[PDB]
Amino acid sequence: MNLESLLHWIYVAGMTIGALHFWSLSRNPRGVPQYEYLVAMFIPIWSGLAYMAMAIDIAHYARYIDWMVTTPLLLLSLSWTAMQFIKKDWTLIGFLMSTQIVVITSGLIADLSERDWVRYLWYICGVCAFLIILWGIWNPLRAKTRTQSSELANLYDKLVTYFTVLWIGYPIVWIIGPSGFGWINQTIDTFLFCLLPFFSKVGFSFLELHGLRNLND
Amino acid sequence: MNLESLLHWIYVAGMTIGALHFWSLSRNPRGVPQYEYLVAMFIPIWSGLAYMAMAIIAHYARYIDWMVTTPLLLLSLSWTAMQFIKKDWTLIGFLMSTQIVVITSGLIADLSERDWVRYLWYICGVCAFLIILWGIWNPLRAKTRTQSSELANLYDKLVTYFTVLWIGYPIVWIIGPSGFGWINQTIDTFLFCLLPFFSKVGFSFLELHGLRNLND
Ligand SMILES: *C/C=C(C)/C=C/C=C(C)/C=C/C1=C(C)CCCC1(C)C
Ligand SMILES: *C/C=C(C)/C=C/C=C(C)/C=C/C1=C(C)CCCC1(C)C
Numbered sequence: 416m417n418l419e420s421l422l423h424w425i426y427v428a429g430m431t432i433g434a435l436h437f438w439s440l441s442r443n444p445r446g447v448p449q450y451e452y453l454v455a456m457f458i459p460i461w462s463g464l465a466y467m468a469m470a471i472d473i474a475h476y477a478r479y480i481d482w483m484v485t486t487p488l489l490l491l492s493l494s495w496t497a498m499q500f501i502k503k504d505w506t507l508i509g510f511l512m513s514t515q516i517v518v519i520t521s522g523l524i525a526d527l528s529e530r531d532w533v534r535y536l537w538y539i540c541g542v543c544a545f546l547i548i549l550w551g552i553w554n555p556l557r558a559k560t561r562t563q564s565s566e567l568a569n570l571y572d573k574l575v576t577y578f579t580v581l582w583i584g585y586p587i588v589w590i591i592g593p594s595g596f597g598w599i600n601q602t603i604d605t606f607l608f609c610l611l612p613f614f615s616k617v618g619f620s621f622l623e624l625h626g627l628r629n630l631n632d
Numbered sequence: 633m634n635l636e637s638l639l640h641w642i643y644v645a646g647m648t649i650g651a652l653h654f655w656s657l658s659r660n661p662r663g664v665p666q667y668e669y670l671v672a673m674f675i676p677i678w679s680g681l682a683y684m685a686m687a688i689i690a691h692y693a694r695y696i697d698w699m700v701t702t703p704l705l706l707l708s709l710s711w712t713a714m715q716f717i718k719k720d721w722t723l724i725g726f727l728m729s730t731q732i733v734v735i736t737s738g739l740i741a742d743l744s745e746r747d748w749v750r751y752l753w754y755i756c757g758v759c760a761f762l763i764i765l766w767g768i769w770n771p772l773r774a775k776t777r778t779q780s781s782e783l784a785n786l787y788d789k790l791v792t793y794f795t796v797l798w799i800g801y802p803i804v805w806i807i808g809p810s811g812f813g814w815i816n817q818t819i820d821t822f823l824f825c826l827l828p829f830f831s832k833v834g835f836s837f838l839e840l841h842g843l844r845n846l847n848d
Contacts, residue, residue, distance in 0.1 A: 506722040506771070513729035513760075520736035527743045544729075555722070 419605045423470035426609040430463035433617030440624055446631030447624065454492050455620040458485050462616050466609075474593070474601060478608060479523045485616065486519060487512035493552060493578055496623055497559045497571050499630075504559065511551050517544040526594050538595070542586055549579060570626045577622060581615045636821045640687035643825045647680035650833030657840055663847035664840060671708050672836040675701045679832055683825075689742050690809070690817060694824060698735045701832060703728035709768060709794055712839055713775045713787050720775065727767050733760040742810050754811070758802055765795060786842045793838060797831045 416424075434456050441452035465481035490511045498504060521541030528534040552575050560568040588611060589595055592604035599607075633641075651673050658669035682697035706727045714720060737757030744750040768791050776784040804827060805811055808820035815823075 504722070506720070506726050509726040510722050510729060513726060513733055516733045517729055517736060520733065520740060523740055524736060524743070527740065 418602055420470050422602075422606055422609045423466045426466045426613060427463050427470060429613045429617060430459035430466065433621070434459040434463065436617075437620060437624060440628070445628040447627045451492065451495055451624070451627065454488050454495075455624055458488050458492075458620060459616045461485055461488075462612060473526055475605070475608070479519060479526070481612075482519045482522075483516065485612075487515045489578075489615065489619065490515050490548070490552075492620065492623055493574065494556060496574055496627065497556045499567055499627065500563050501559065507551075507555060511548060511556070514544050514547050514551070517541075518548065522589065538586075538590065545582070545586065548582075552578065566630055570630055574619070574623055574626065578619060581611060581619070584611045635818055637687050639821055639825050640683045643683050643829065644680050644687060646829050646833060647676035647683070650829075650837070651676045651680070653833075654836060654840060657844070662844040664843045668708065668711055668840070668843070671704055671711075672840055675704050675708075675836065676832050678704075679828060691821070691824070695735060695739045695742075697828075698738075699732065701828075702735060703731045705794075705831065705835065706731050706764070706768075708836065708839055709790065710772060712790060712843065713772045715783055715843065716779050717775065723767075723771060723775075727764060727772070730760050730763055730767070733757070734764065738805065750810075754802075754806065761798070761802065765798075768794065782846055786846060790835070790839055790842065794835060797827060797835070800827050 437452060437455045437459075440447075441449065441456065444452070461484050462481045465477045468477045469475060491508060494508045494511060495503070518541045521537050521544060525534050525537035525541060528537060557571065557575065560571045584607075588604065588607045591598040592607075593599075593601050594604075654669055654672040654676075657664075658666060658673070661669065678700050679697045682693040685693045707724060710724045710727060711719070734757045737753050737760060741750050741753035741757065744753060773787065773791065776787045800823075804820065804823045807814045808823075809817050
């Protein structure tokens, strides 16, 4: 077992404990609907299985297949929270989910590219889609909370802030590592791509679910 | 000049004449707002330039064309569906983004070494495309039911035409060198010249003349 494998196995253990936690919470719901629990549970399982694949073995192909599914589901969870006590705006949800899939596919195309100028344009394409996500979660998604209580609005702000900080991390780590400028080697890059998603997948959903449970009482 | 190059140049001239026509119509608009003309003009210009580049993976620029023109085509279709009502921009964005997923999936599929990987990405693109088809036939179609039956009937003809052509793309892809290889690159190129002509000039021609005739 090499270092990358070990980091991946640790991440797999992390996902496993978070999903069990979310499962445990789902059994004593405290006013939180089951669909929120189930998505919160599915995210780390999907990511867990993708990382397990890498642990058993372009580099880290499975990382993209993880993101293909987990990142729109994370936006779904964020969107459910913003609209917790109102009608769910499904086309807004759909907008955010699909735009986020463009970010990931752009990243993958970028990483599959042999010419540097092409690689970076696809990266920029990914960043642009990501900027639309950030505009989306800070403006129209955020305005949905204004018709609801300030407890919910405050919870959202905390969640969207935590969400934003972590998500900005991905394009940065991508571009400083072997896929981009090569300022860091693959093993350190893998390490950051374990630490960052643990907080995005377990950390975020943990704050989401506990926030919603305390808000209900 | 070889055969594909000639086909791409004929396509360029096709795009050029379509773009001039729509520009000409915009000067006597008949109640059709300028933004609909401008998108109708932009589509074949973008496509023409991508094909011009090709005339001067195989056919990369074909995807870069699609990256832009297919969501713009969905923008036009949407504007038509909501011609005499408030624009549902989140519905528009959903269709536009989902359509970009179709194209990026298509490209990733075409970039894939392993066959099983190629085909899964193809399937993913087909799934996103199925969601587009559901979108244009259901929530987008429902927008027309609040408006006049003349508009509703026009949309019905337009969405049918739109749907028929768009189904051709995943077919032409899979039967050519990117898929099963039932047809060579030259014939594949020929189809990828015919189909877009009808999707870009044909559809916008029917959209614009349909809306103008509806207003009188
Ligand atoms: C659990 C995993 C998460 C939340 C991953 C998020 C990943 C991103 C926000 C990736 C963004 C990228 C760009 C904005 C530019 C292209 C490169 C990507 C895919 C790393
Ligand atoms: C002017 C060009 C147009 C309207 C192109 C449309 C292209 C498609 C609808 C392509 C669809 C595909 C799939 C559904 C599966 C993946 C392969 C593609 C990209 C050919």
